[PDB]
Symmetry: D2
Subunit: 293 residues, 4 copies
């Protein structure tokens, strides 16, 4: 398996006005990430790709398009989690067949699952596909002791590589890197990249890398080298941009920024607001002028 460390953009998907996938636009998003953002890889089918609002067939179409466009140019991780474990296995088999470098899967949601149920979910996707797996932060933890024990149980299956860490708990992060040093951690909070990199995370998966990949790489590399003053200056500008994106509407703003760079990033998928308002477009133009020009 290919090196999975580094900067991964969580791939946004271009949709048409009617909610269908715009394949031409999706390929332009992929090309922008590989050629201009210079990412180490793409994280396909995650939250950022508006994955959970789509059919199984649409998810397969996006996996097809991303692998065909990226080829072997960069590493590709396929997020295949679902509340439906049979769907997660089907998507995991498909992504495996397409050649994805590894799978990832959100914790099953909508119902409250016990830890044994979550571990069985991951072990089943791994056993049925034969692919390695990146897990997600374990929900509803009451303590770090329990958190480390549970990662330790997930981490009994040798095909579990590590975790996409979204919890805002740097104590737990430090504990996990100490207890399981050979397992990888990818930061899942772009606005907290510096402190995560200071604790030795192995990479980052993020939605804002679709437009801010240059600064994201700089923060990560400078931090690993101990150049914290400069890394913080770049995190400050990055977070001014991220604060504006969050206030204006996360996926719509990143798509509107991509449109200003000549990428046909399209609409969002309903039930999310599909069309950016004039105000949202106006704010996206201002953010591009201030931070990406």
């Amino acid at each position: 398996m290919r090196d999975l460390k580094g900067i991964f953009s969580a791939l946004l998907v271009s949709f048409n006005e009617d909610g269908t996938i715009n394949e031409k636009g999706l390929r332009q998003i992929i090309r922008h990430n590989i050629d201009k953002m210079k990412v180490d890889g793409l994280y396909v089918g995650g939250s950022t790709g508006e994955n959970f609002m789509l059919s199984t067939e649409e998810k397969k179409e996006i996996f097809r398009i991303a692998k065909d466009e990226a080829k072997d140019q960069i590493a590709l991780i396929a997020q295949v989690g679902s509340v439906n474990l049979k769907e997660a296995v089907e998507l995991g088999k498909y992504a495996t067949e397409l050649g994805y470098d590894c799978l990832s899967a959100v914790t099953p949601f909508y119902y409250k699952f016990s830890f044994p149920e979550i571990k069985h979910y991951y072990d089943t996707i791994i056993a049925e596909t034969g692919s390695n797996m990146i897990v997600y932060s374990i929900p509803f933890l009451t303590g770090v002791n329990m958190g480390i024990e549970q990662f330790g149980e997930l981490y009994k299956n040798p095909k579990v590589l590590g975790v996409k860490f979204t919890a805002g708990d740097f104590y737990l992060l430090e504990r996990l890197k100490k207890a399981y040093p050979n397992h990888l951690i990818w930061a899942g909070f772009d606005e907290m990249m510096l402190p995560a990199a200071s604790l030795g995370v192995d990479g980052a998966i993020g939605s804002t890398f679709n437009v801010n990949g240059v600064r994201a790489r700089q923060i990560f590399e400078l931090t690993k080298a101990g150049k914290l003053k400069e890394a913080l200056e770049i995190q400050h500008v990055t977070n001014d941009l991220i604060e504006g994106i969050l206030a204006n509407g996360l996926y719509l703003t990143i798509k509107e920024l991509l449109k200003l760079e000549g990428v046909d990033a399209g609409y969002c998928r309903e039930p999310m607001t599909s069309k950016a308002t004039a105000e949202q477009v106006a704010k996206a133009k201002d953010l591009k002028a201030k931070f990406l020009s």
Copy 2:
């Protein structure tokens, strides 16, 4: 449209060991509810039916089976909500075509939706199907004032009939019944049936009515008549049973209780633990002896 007030069992589904639907067992669950539990209706495809772990085709199969088995004997509500609005419209059209009396839909989940997005979701399902709709408690409310305003906006579409109330806020419940007296409220907390009925809820949708329908009807009717001392005695026994069911595993325990009554309630669907442990079966036998014998 048929009367939708009263006691609705949230229909459990029988699954085989491999996770597929057991149609014979599902028909036995339906017959037990209509003939023995004497419910006013069934709420099909809800959380209790393990709906969100299933494919769209499986959901359609369950809607087919429930309508064919129940015919016009009782009222039938179809829960068709999803994170995928195109799926919710497809399921809503199918349930409408089958003759369901009304639709219901959970709030779109997994992402955080704004109120306008939630209202557009409901208005879209209604517009595309032509069916009336029961909404779910609005998530993440910061106040009752906002809650009532938002119900008031949902309640601008004349085809929204009312709400399946799951929030444990009887102040909000009272406010909603006062502000919108012609809109219905169904209690969605079996262990809080008495206090809900004391505030004039119009019915209840519940998972434990699959086995405790007799007491549920008694609590509801006695409470509406002002016979609170007796209603509370029956709520006390009901809650001893419900406390045992919750501690032992909700859907598995209700299925194990149904098996003790000769109903082939089957297994649960994975990622939920599919097979009851010997201990879980043992606890289900004890609950049946104490409360349903």
Copy 3:
């Protein structure tokens, strides 16, 4: 022992502009509650009396004044809880010496205390004073079994009479009455009086009874009689008043309502805003016109 069931106003305290106690105004509030609100008793030194913003000497002054003004006309409960257990024992001894009918004490706060620490706190106040005690809802519970288990442990002390229930969990409320039927429960949510009375609470302790005591008694007695239609109409009017009070500022609005009836309820104590704005006074007059005229 002096009967502690029924309607208890959580006594408000009148403060001067400089924050000192206005004894004449406090006596007028007491007289209003006894003579006009027709309460069964007063709950002195609770949250509503702005107790936690005061010195130990000020708390003693309020206990002295309330007992001297009320004499033996009504029941009197003294809230003496604190984060400082030595202070709670001092106040408990003083209220006992003055003749208060029972003590009550908030769970020790600020810090996170274990259940054994909370039980030792209550047992210490009781042992050092010789007085009966009303406890408060146990915080940070994870389940009803454990909540009930812990109330059981508190109730092993025969001098613990019951609880002032503020938690918004009517399943827990029902479980408490099921488990410990001889122990008392006072509702601590005025806007949820009807549903609480439907579950058998023995009385209610509330801030709004200082001005709405007549309706509060009607809701309680009508609900106990099973006259739910009439009780619900009075709860509806009551909750229109409570909604307005809460939106305008709880403490300041009840004091302004008392001022309009000729009770010198004075200012609030800092760090709470001490004086009402012109807009707050205008809204309070509108509430008086609509609901207390």
Copy 4:
């Protein structure tokens, strides 16, 4: 002004078996911190000093003893916050008269205060004492823009120097340094010292520095120098010790660790468990053997 940057131990207080202050033991704790832990200063009267369980006179006694023992050898900050603003002003005046270098004050608690009330509280303590102030993280925030907005409002008072940051939000931490670069931030989470120092905090206030001050200074200074590999190794050992301390009981374990070094750290104050169990003492000795020998 006296430099307030660097490592500040949140001073523990020694209590006798009866809960009274053990002045000799308190002086030994102070001496240990100054002479052995090599702290830059002490934070007196905070959570760690068990302040909120004490009377106003006891708080004054601790302020007197700490200033008399420390004299002018180190920097001294006095935490004087309370729910009682008159008490906070009294304590602020006393600590100012004694020569403390700065005041600090927890957000008023128990009740829910508005932002204007919190700002008036801080402005009142400052105006009545003439002393500089360190505020606490603002509670119940809904967003970073509003959190930053409110710190801006507090910082309009030139005597507010910065904040003791306890919130577990490093995005907010970064936004605070971006917005108000000349204002100070002290980290209040010992186990997250490295990532906090990576974001430019100016110092740290902690309970574990009473026994782990040598490593705490190394983490802070190494991180500021960009020596992350070395700082992370020391944070790893530190967090092994902190994890054990937290699991065994924070207050009691640090006092037992001090007792093993010959410091009469005494008992804890009730309502906290005053004496360690045999198991707690055994575990504390194991922690001393492994990490402080």
